[model samples]
Target chain A: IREGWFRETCSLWPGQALSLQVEQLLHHRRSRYQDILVFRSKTYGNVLVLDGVIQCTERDEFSYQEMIANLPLCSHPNPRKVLIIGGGDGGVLREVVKHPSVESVVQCEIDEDVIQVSKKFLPGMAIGYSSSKLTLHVGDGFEFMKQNQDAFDVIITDSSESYYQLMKTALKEDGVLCCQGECQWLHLDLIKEMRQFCQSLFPVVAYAYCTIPTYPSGQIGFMLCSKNPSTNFQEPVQPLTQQQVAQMQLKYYNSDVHRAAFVLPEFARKALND
Target chain B: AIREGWFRETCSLWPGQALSLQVEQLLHHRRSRYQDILVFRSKTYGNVLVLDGVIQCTERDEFSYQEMIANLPLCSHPNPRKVLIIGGGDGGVLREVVKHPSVESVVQCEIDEDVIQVSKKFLPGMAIGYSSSKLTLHVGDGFEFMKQNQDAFDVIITDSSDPMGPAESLFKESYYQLMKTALKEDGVLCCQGECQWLHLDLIKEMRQFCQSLFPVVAYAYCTIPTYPSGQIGFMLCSKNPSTNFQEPVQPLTQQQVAQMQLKYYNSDVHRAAFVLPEFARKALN
Candidate 1:
C-alpha cells in the first residue's frame, strides 16, 4: 500500500486529487471482501478507508450518516423496519436506530472483519452495535435480500447497479431505498442515468446532496426512491422539531436541510429537474 | 519568471482543513502595497485570481459570487438607479450590476488599479463591466471615497476581499457608519460576508453591529466550488424598515435571466439564498 500522504485516485476525478496529512495508521488489514485501513488524520479525526476509498471520518461522518438515514426514514410515514447493506463501519446503523418509530434494524455486512475492526477502533460508530433494535448479519447483502423479501420500510445500501433491482424487490410496497450516488461535479450523467432507471421501477425518485469535506469535491450525492407514486421526497413526511433534533443529538439532517439538499445548482437543476 | 510545473494555491479557510486547486500555469503575479496579487489559468477552473495567497475568483465558478453579490441588493431595491461598488477591482460585480435596466450609473472605487489592468488583459468576460457607459471607476480607498459622497447611491455594494489587511476596515462598525451616510434614505447596503462554516462568530458580531446601525439586516449565502467550504455569504442591511431583503422587488423572468447570460441568480434563487442551514440559522438568528 502507498504510505505517508493519502492520495485519492478515481477516473471520475482525474488529475485533481484530494490528499490528507496522515498522523498515523491506527489499523491496517485485508478483509475478505476488501482492504480495510483506519488512520488518525491530522486535520480530520479518525478516518476509515475501504479499498483505497475514504468510507467515513469521525468529524464529518455524521453528515453522510444522518442525511442518508433520516432522508428516507423521515419521508416514510412509519419506518418500523430498516435494512442497511455494506455499512460495516456501523455509521449508517448508528443513524438508523435513532428513529424512535423503528423497532428493528437488520445490518447485513459481507465483511465481518470490517465490523469487528470498527468495534475496536471507531467506538463512536461502533456504538451502533449496542442498540437493542439492531440485528447483525455477517453475510452477503444480495444473498440476505433474496432470503428476506418485502420485510423493510427502508433499505439503505451502497451496492452497485445490479443490486439496485434486487434492493427494489426487497422493499415493502410503500418502502423507500437510499443509496450513495456519485459526486455531482463529476457524476451528473450517472446521477441522471440512475434517476431514469429508478423511475422506471419506482413511482417516486429524487436526488439530494450533502456536504462532506472528505469526499471528492467536498460534496456527495444520494438517490432516494419511494414505492408510493404520490410521495414528495423534497419535504419530510415526519419532520423533526428543533427539540427532537436536539434530543436525538443530530448535528445535521434538520427539516430545513432535508429541503435544502434537494435544491440543486443550475447545472444540476437543468440535468435532474425533469 | 513563471514556474515550470503545476501552480497550486493553498487557502487556509479553516484551522484543520485547507483547499488546494491545481493551476495550469501562472498568468500574472505582482506585489501591490496592500497585498500580493496573482492570476493563473487553472486546468478546470479557467483563469484564476488570487489576492495575498487567498483565492478571489476563478473564471469557472465566479458567476455564483459576482451575480449573487450584485443582484441580491440591486434586485431588492425598488429602482436602483445609482449603485456604488467598493473594492471590486475584478469588474465581475460591475458586469452584473449593469445587467439591471434600472441601474443608470455605477461607481466602482478600487484601491488597486493593477487588479483592473491584469483582469482586463486576461478575463475579457469580467472586464466587460469596464466598457459600460454607466460605470465611473475611481482608483482610491473605499473608506475615503464613501465619506466624500453622501446620499449618492441607491444601492451600495462592497465586493472587497476577505476582512484582512486593507479590507479589515470594511468589516468594522465605523465603515458601516460611513456606508449609512453614503446611502439614500431607503438605500440598501451589501458586503461580502465570510464563510458561514468558518466565520460564524465574525458573522454574528457583524450582524449585531449592523442591526444596531441599520433598521433591517439579513444574511444570505451562495455556492462557489473554489470558495472555502464551497460556500460564500453576504450581509444585507437596509436603512428602510419596510424593505424586504429576502424577496426581490424586481424579480427577473426566465427570459431576462437568459438574456443576461447568467448561470446563477434567478428570482427563486434570490429567495432561497436567505434560507440558511440548521446550524447557520440557529446561530445567526
Candidate 2:
C-alpha cells in the first residue's frame, strides 16, 4: 500500500494528483463493497474517501450534492416519487427532500456499513437519516431496480452498469434520470458515447457541469435525460422561486444556474452536438 | 517555504487554509526590483509562475485566464486595430491578443523587465507572442505609460497581478481614469477583478469606481485551477455607452476559432462568461 500522506490520483490523467493535508485519520475500514476512510483536514474539514477516491468533503459537499439532486428534480415537473442509487452518505437524500412536491424517496445503497459510519462520524450530512419521507433500502441498486418497475418520477444514480436500462424500465414515461458523468476535460469520448447510449433510450438527453474543487479537473459532470420528448433539460420545468431557494437553504442551484449548467464549452458543444 | 514535500499558498483563501501541490523541483528563484519572482516544476501542474509568493499562473491551466482576458474585450469591439496591454509581462495575454487578425499594432508596458526575460526563457509557450512584429514591448510603469498615450488604442487590457505592491494602482479609481483617456471613444477596457467568491466586497467597490468613469461596465469570470477558489473574475468596461459587452460585435465561426488555435473564448463562451451566479448577481447589483 502507498504510505505516508494521502493523495487521490486522477485516473483520467497520468502523473496528476490532488492532495490535502490530513490532520488526523478518524476512521478506516474495508466495507463489504468498498474501502471507506474518514479523515480531517485543516482546510477541507472532515474528508470522506471510498476506494481511494475522494467521495465528499465537509466544506464542498453541498456543491456536488445540490447540483446532482436539484438538476433533475427541478427539471421534472411535479416529481412525486424519487429513487437514489449508491448515495448512502444521505447527502443526496438531504437535497431530495427539499422539494415540497416530492412525497416519498427510496434510497438503494449497497453497503450498510457506509450508512452507519457516516451516521456516527459525519453527523452534519447524516441528518438526512431523520427524514420521515425517506425509505432506506440496504441492498444492491441493480437488484432493487429490477424488482421495481414504472415506479419513480425521478431517479438519481452514480452506478454505470446494465443498471441504466433497468432504471429506464423503472422510470415513468415523463420521468427524468440524472447520473454522474466523468469530467469533460478528459472523458469527452466516454461522455459522447454515454450520451448517444442514453439518446437511444430517452427522448431528451443533455450534459451539465459544476465546480467541485476536490474532483479531478476541479469539476464534475452530470448526464440528464428525460423520457418525454417535449421536456426541456436546459431550463427546469418547475423553476424554484426565491422563497423556496431560501427555505431549502440551497448553496449552489438557482434557476439561473440551472440554465447556465447546460451551456457547454465550445469543444464539448461541437463534440456532443455532432 | 516548503512544508512536508509540498508548497502551499494560503493567503487568497480563508485564514489557516491553503491549496497545496506536489513539487518535483525548484527551477528558478529571484528577487527582482519590485517583487520576488519564483518558478517551479510542479508535479502535476507543470511549470508554475509565482510573484511575491502569490501564484501567478501555472502551465497546465493558464489558457483559461489568458484567452478569456484577451478575447472578451478584443472581440467586443468592432475592428480593433490598435491595442495596449498593461502589466502582462508573462506574455500569455499577448498570445491571445495577437490571434485577432484585425489588430494592427500592440504595445505592452510592463514595469519589471525581469518578468519579461524570465518568462521568455522558461515559459516558451506563453512567450511565443513576443516573436510577433506587431508587438512593441516597453519596460516602464503602466500608470506613467497610460498618462503619455492619449486616444491611442482600440482595446486596453490590464492583466496585472493582485492589488498589492507595485500593482496596487491598477485597482484604484485613477488608474481607470487614465485608461479612459488612453482609449478611443468606442474602445473597450478589461481589468483583472479578483476572485468573486472571496473578494465580493472588493469587487463591488472596484466596480462602482469603474461605473463612475465608464458608461457600460460589466463583470465576468472564468475558472483557473491554480488561482484561489479555483476561479477568478474580470471587469469589462467600455467608452461607448450603448456597447453591449455580453455580445461580441464580431462573432467567430468554428473554422475561424480552430484556425486561431484557441483553447477557450468562443462566441458562445463569451456570452456564458457574463452569466454570474445568484450570490454574485445580488452583490454586483
Candidate 3:
C-alpha cells in the first residue's frame, strides 16, 4: 500500500469486482497527498500496492527492478549525472545508485507525502531516499525538468504508467530526450506508444521483458532509450561493472541476461524497431 | 495522481470481488476422455474439457500433437513398422504417422464417430490430419480392435484421456496386457499421462502398470500454456531402450529430440524434463 490518492480512487470505484485488500505491515500518511503502505496479505504477502494493482512485492521484485535497470545501464560507459522521476520508494534509485560513476541523483517527485510515508512505512524501499547524493525535491517533476539547464548523463522515469501527463506525453520525443524512459507492459497503450516515442526521439532504443508469474497474464515489459546510435555497445560492456557485479547479489539481470532481454521476438521487433 | 479517471467503467467494483463468466463459455468446460467420444464446446482454444481433464483449449496448430506421437515411435522402432493409434480422433496422430518414411501403413481405431464428425465441422486443422491415404479409421472399441489383431503392429500411441469418467476402463492392468499381445517384439507405446499437479497418484499407478508390462518405461513433462497448469507430462514405454534415455547435460543430442518439438520443445529440454527434484524422484521411483 502506497500513494493514497491512487488507492482511494481505486477502492472508491462503484461497480468494480476486485476490492483493494489492505493490511498494515508498513504504513505512512503525510499532511498533503501522500500515503505509502507496504503490507502482508493472504494472496500476495509483503505487497507494495500503489493504487490497487500490485507494483512489487517482497517475495519477487528482482525480475522487474533488475530488467529495467541493468539492460540499458550495461550500454552506457560512464553515466555520471542521473535523474529519477517519481520513484519515491527508492527501488529504481537503489538499483541505479549502485553505479559508482553516478555522481549525483536529482529525484523530482510531486508528492512530499509519498516520500515521507515511504520513509516511515517501507524503510528498505525508502532507504535510498536518504542517500547523500540523492537530491530529493518534493515538487512537480515536469516543472522541475523545465527549470533544469544541465542535461543528465542518464534519466529514469519510474512513475506509475497510470500517471496522466507522464503517460500521455510518454511517447513524445521532446519529453524523452533527457534520459532512459521506462514503461511497464501491463500499461499496453503506454508500452506500445512510449517505445514508439522513445524510438523517434533516440537513435537507439530497446525494450526488455520479464515474466512475472504472480501478476495477471504473468508477463511484464520495460523499454529504454538512448541518443547514441548503438544500443548494444558491440564492444564488450559489463552488465554490472565487474566490481559492482561481484558485490551485489542480484536475482535477475546477470551479464548474459542483460544481452538476452533486448532480443525481442520477431512480432515485437517488427512493431517496436520501426 | 497515479490512478485513472475511468472510474465508472472499471470491472473492479463488482460483487463477490470477482468477475463472472458462464461455465460453458469457459475453456475447461468439456473433457474428451476417449477417441470415440470427444467432448468440447465452441469456445477459446477449442475449449474442449476432455474427460474431466483440461488440455490446451486453444487452436490445434498450437502444438504438433500428431507429429510427436508419430515420430516418437517411427524413429525408434526396428523396421517392419506397421503402426496403430488406439485413440486419436482429432486426426493429429494419424497425420504424424503418415509423415514417417519407414511406416508401411497406419491403422487408427477410434470408437467415437461423433468426434470425427465434430472435427470435420469445428477442428479444421485436425481435419487436415485425417485426409491421409495411409490413415485407415475403424469406428470400434480400442480393446476390441486390438484383440482382433495379433502382434501385428510395431508401434502404438494410446492418446487417451484421464481414467475418471468415461475413460475408467483404460486404467486397468489388463489393457497393458492387451497392448502387449497386440504389438510385435520391438513395439513402443506412448500415452497422455494427465496433469502431474492434479493426477500425481494416477501417474504413480500408471508408472507401476507400465513398468510391469514393458521392459523400459519412463515419463517426461512438457510445458503448454493452456493446460490446466501450463504443464503436461507424457509417458513412453517400450520393449527396447529408446534413444531419448534421460541424461543430465545433453544426454540426448538436439538432432534426436529436434523433431519431437512443435511450438517449443528442444533437445536440451527433452533431457531436462527427466531431471526431477528429490521429491519427484522418490514419488516416481
Best by DockQ: 1
Per-model TM-score on C-alpha atoms = 0.92, 0.89, 0.55
What docking grade does candidate 3 earn? incorrect
Clashing pairs in 2: none
Listed models, DockQ each: 0.42, 0.36, 0.08
lDDT by residue (tens digit), candidate 1, B1-285: 233344434445564444556667778888987888889887777888888877888887789889999999988899889999998888999999998888899999998888888889888889889999999889888987888988888999999876666786676679998999999999999999877767789899999999999999999988776776677899999999988988788889878887988777788778878877666787887
Q: What is the lDDT of residue A116 in candidate 1?
A: 86
TM-score of the A chain in model 1: 0.96
lDDT of 3 by residue, A183-270 (tens): 2322435556876665564666556655443343234565565555644532225545534555754655556455544543322443
TM-score, chain B, model 2, is: 0.97
Q: lDDT for model 2, on a 0 to 1 scale?
A: 0.83
Cα lDDT, model 1, residue A211: 76
Q: Give candidate 3 misplaced runs (Cα > 4 Å).
A: A1-39, A112-124, A161-196, A233-236, A240-246, B1-55, B59-285
Better of 1 and 2 by TM-score: 1
lDDT of candidate model 3 versus the reference: 0.54
**Per-residue CA lDDT of candidate 1, range A1-274, in tens?**
2346566556566535566667888998897678888888877788888888888888778888888899999899999999998888888888888888999998888888888888987889889999999888878887788886788899998542667778878888999988988777777899999988988888899998887667877778899999888789988999999899888888767998888888776667777873
Residue A28 C-alpha lDDT in model 2? 90
Each predicted model: what fraction of the native A–B Cα contacts (within 8 Å) does it retain? Answer: 0.19, 0.26, 0.07
Q: Write the per-residue lDDT of candidate 2 for residues B156-177, one digit (tens) a residue.
A: 9999976676887676678898
